[PDB]
Symmetry: D4
Subunit: 75 residues, 8 copies
């Protein structure tokens, strides 16, 4: 029910989780914001189709990171 799930820690030191049903839903979210609220927040967990990707970096860099991964291998 959720291809992409992202957990990050916000400036109040609380965990927040956002999900996207498809990859295209994630792309639309990136295109919609001039600046995302969470763009500078460290990512605690990035999962794609249930697979944990070993991502280290900010929420804002996820978009670029995803494009350079071979994603078809996750089924």
């Amino acid at each position: 029910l959720n291809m992409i799930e992202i957990t990050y820690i916000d400036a109040s030191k609380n965990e927040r989780t956002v999900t996207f049903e498809s990859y295209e839903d994630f792309e639309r979210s990136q295109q919609a914001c001039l600046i995302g609220v969470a763009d500078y927040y460290p990512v605690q967990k990035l999962t794609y189709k249930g697979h944990n990707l070993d991502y280290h970096g900010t929420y804002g860099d996820i978009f670029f990171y995803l494009m350079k991964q071979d994603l078809s291998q996750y089924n």
Copy 2:
């Protein structure tokens, strides 16, 4: 069937249309952006459940406008 459709004119003087499946999806998109790309753009058409609302304003003001409306009148 999209519940919300918004057409606005961007800085290239081109009409752009975005859609949301639920009010919740629209609210989430508002919460996600520190600043939305389209927030200062004039709205050409705001449609809710197939009804054209009589909306004269910017994209960024839609959220506050919709919250003051009784949307139960639209079916």
Copy 3:
């Protein structure tokens, strides 16, 4: 309402905001990093009933009022 400000937004619609006191206005200036209306042209600025001859953006009102002598109104 001690201060009333009318401006034109990017959809070319008139909008009006009011502040009950000068301190309410000051507080709204300190509260935003950027005000939504900061770059909007001002059509009318009213101080205690008086139409001030103001020509400029919403964001410039604060510095304008600071330099004026308001005790005469």
Copy 4:
């Protein structure tokens, strides 16, 4: 003061802001493109004297309150 919010700023000092009504709070949210305090952690959020159990940033308060059934207070 129906709404009172205490938060910690970037100099590590506590600051408090108050809103006389929920509608005054809504107006302040609508007024700023970005609020100065939006990324500051909230130390206390009170509503009609009730200490709400809020854990989050100042900028997330608006969406939080919108979700709560405040009538219980």
Copy 5:
């Protein structure tokens, strides 16, 4: 010469042209800026490997536009 050429009109009504040696250079500029100075400026010409793409939009929308096009036909 340059794989990507972009001409836009700035707020002084002057035409400005920027160029990128490769698509990856263009991608690097996009990732580097939180906000690019030209992002809201209308594009008058977008050229890819010498070919005028029929692009109608802002500078800021070019990246997503390019990502969706099949570029190996130029």
Copy 6:
């Protein structure tokens, strides 16, 4: 007596001290009007000096403008 009416020292994100000076109060006010957002606005102030007097200020660079406006500075003339 003092070259600059306003001197401000703050700590940036690299944890280094930066000092800016304003020859007059008007120069400072002009600088506040000229920036939509100032680079240093969220930085803590380590020292705020007005006409050579270290004011006992605790806050961000961005909040100096409002602080000064509310102070009675007549005691410094």
Copy 7:
């Protein structure tokens, strides 16, 4: 010459505004001080350096880079 740099631009209310800098270094410090300058996207009606009208066509924000690329020594 009163001020080394004089800039007139048109703000969003379509009014002419003029700012001056006594020295080039004052002008540089003002460009370092703002993350974003209020006037950066405003069109420039006149740019005067040491009393000389420069033939400047552009936005306020681009002046800094324009001046850095010019040989301004002819104006000394």
Copy 8:
């Protein structure tokens, strides 16, 4: 790579970016209204293979380099 800059981002990781010339760097500064890394601490700054004694944020590198006589190198 004539200019090499290592900084630390919102997540102590180090990242390195390079520019082929001073002119290339200058163009990169003109192109962003705000650079993603502008507030990040610089851990190393190299010009033509020489480590410069730079203590500051990424965003302040430009004003630092502009004041140096780089022909020395």
